């Protein structure tokens, strides 16, 4: 099948390049640019700021272009500067001169990754229902492409921490290739505003601010709470990646059947089910008395991504007009998720020193669980009452 294999490999090489960036970036500020941990807490503070004006902006374009590949050409274009840009540019620019200067160059990302990954999901999702395949399939490539790269940052990470990057930049042109050969064949922004008054959006978004925002904040300190469960910080962390590397293959496998499970259960129960494993993981983390537990727990993450990613599209397409699938994705499951993730992540911090972890997480469960349970009724569609 023409589109399936091209855009399936597209996810493979796209998320491979998140590979270099995702778990490696903090290291490359940490070690290779000797920047201080007191400076990297601002860099992230900017990479998100820009994204806040790229994510909605990418949503309207990703619909107005429809199946036109122009917006995905820009991304594949910017991704090619992976290699010259950190080596050539993002490297010298904040060291000799005030970081505040190079911090802007950080916008690179905001564009490519934080606000560009979901634009790749959404676009390939639209193609996913003009060809004959399921979005969960092919998207499953993302996990294995992230797993493949995930194993390589650490291994050559101590022999040539410039190839990981260089390797990523190379895959960007492979990404240009697959974008070209693949062959694939509305609204106005004032009709787009109509959705923001429609009360069916405020319920879906509510679910995101409630369940998904709470989940993506939690999974923020988790690591710091997992390392404490092994002897030495290095032995503890070492085990972590292994969980991440190994559990993503399950996730990819889980995603493989995901769309079959998703297609009948229906969209709403897909999100409710996703909300449940996120809720259980939030409250479960509080009751921790052993690692073999904090491992399991990290694995559930792979049990909640399949449904969520696949499920949200089934929801958005099923209950909303498809003339807005990219927009209400990049505004609800991305924009509104990140906008609220500024604020909790504050709150969580205060809770720790106020109620440590145990006491904090416990709260997340009720909040995450409460909202999950509430969205059996705020979300329109068929609840779990049907089966």
């Amino acid at each position, epitope marked *: 099948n023409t589109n399936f294999w091209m855009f399936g490999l597209f996810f493979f090489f796209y998320f491979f390049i998140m590979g270099a960036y995702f778990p490696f970036f903090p290291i490359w500020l940490h070690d290779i640019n000797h920047i201080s941990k007191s400076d990297t807490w601002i860099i992230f503070a900017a990479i998100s700021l820009f994204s806040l004006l790229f994510q909605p902006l990418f949503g309207l374009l990703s619909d107005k272009l429809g199946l036109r590949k122009y917006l995905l050409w820009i991304i594949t274009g910017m991704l090619v500067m992976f290699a010259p840009f950190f080596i050539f540019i993002f490297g010298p620019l904040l060291q000799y001169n005030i970081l505040v200067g190079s911090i802007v160059g950080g916008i690179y990302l905001g564009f490519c990754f934080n606000a560009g990954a979901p634009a790749v999901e959404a676009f390939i999702e639209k193609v996913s229902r003009r060809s004959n395949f399921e979005f969960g399939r092919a998207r499953m490539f993302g996990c294995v492409g992230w797993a493949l790269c995930a194993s390589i940052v650490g291994i050559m990470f101590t022999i040539n921490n410039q190839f990981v990057f260089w390797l990523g930049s190379g895959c960007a042109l492979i990404l240009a290739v697959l974008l070209f050969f693949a062959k694939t064949d509305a609204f106005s922004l004032k009709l787009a505003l109509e959705l923001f008054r429609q009360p069916k959006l405020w319920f879906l978004s509510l679910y995101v601010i409630g369940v998904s925002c709470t989940y993506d904040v939690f999974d923020q300190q988790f690591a710091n709470f997992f390392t404490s469960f092994f*002897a030495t910080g*290095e032995q*503890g962390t070492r085990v972590f990646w292994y969980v991440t590397t190994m559990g993503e293959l399950l996730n990819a496998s889980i995603m493989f059947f995901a769309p079959l499970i998703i297609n009948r259960i229906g969209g709403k129960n897909a999100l409710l089910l996703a909300g449940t494993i996120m809720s259980v993981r939030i409250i479960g983390s509080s009751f921790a008395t052993s690692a073999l537990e904090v491992v399991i727990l990290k694995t559930l993450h792979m049990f909640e991504v399949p449904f969520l990613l696949v499920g949200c599209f089934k929801y958005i397409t099923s209950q909303f007009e498809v003339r807005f699938s990219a927009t209400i994705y990049l505004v609800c499951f991305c924009f509104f998720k990140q906008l609220a993730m500024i604020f909790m992540s504050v709150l969580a911090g205060n809770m*720790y020193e106020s109620i440590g972890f145990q006491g904090a997480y416990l709260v997340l469960g009720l909040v995450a669980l409460g909202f999950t349970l509430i969205s059996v009724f705020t979300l329109s569609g068929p609840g779990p009452l049907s089966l």
Partner: nanobody
Amino acid sequence: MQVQLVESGGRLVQAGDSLRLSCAASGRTFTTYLMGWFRQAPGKEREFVAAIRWSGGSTYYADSVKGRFTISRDNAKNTVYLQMNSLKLEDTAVYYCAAAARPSYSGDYGYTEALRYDYWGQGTQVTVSS
């Protein structure tokens, strides 16, 4: 945050004898998620001794002290113990309790890493005779 830990115990003891250290915690009762004993002499550094986690009571001890020491707790009255048997001569050094509670940035620390805990107690020296 200010919770605080108070050690008791320690005294002179003869090679082969016993001691019982206790560590009270004034504030605590939600935060500290894990308690440990660490010791320090001269010559060398802070050395991990034993760790335990309130909820559940799972214990860990750095090899050099297994079977010889027992770390226990008793929530019920904000206190963690170290029962030290078969003492030796090397076993002389200031013993500290420490408790965890909040997180803290870097490449993360584990259950033997001193830098890992968010709080400490003053001390109570322990001298085992030659």
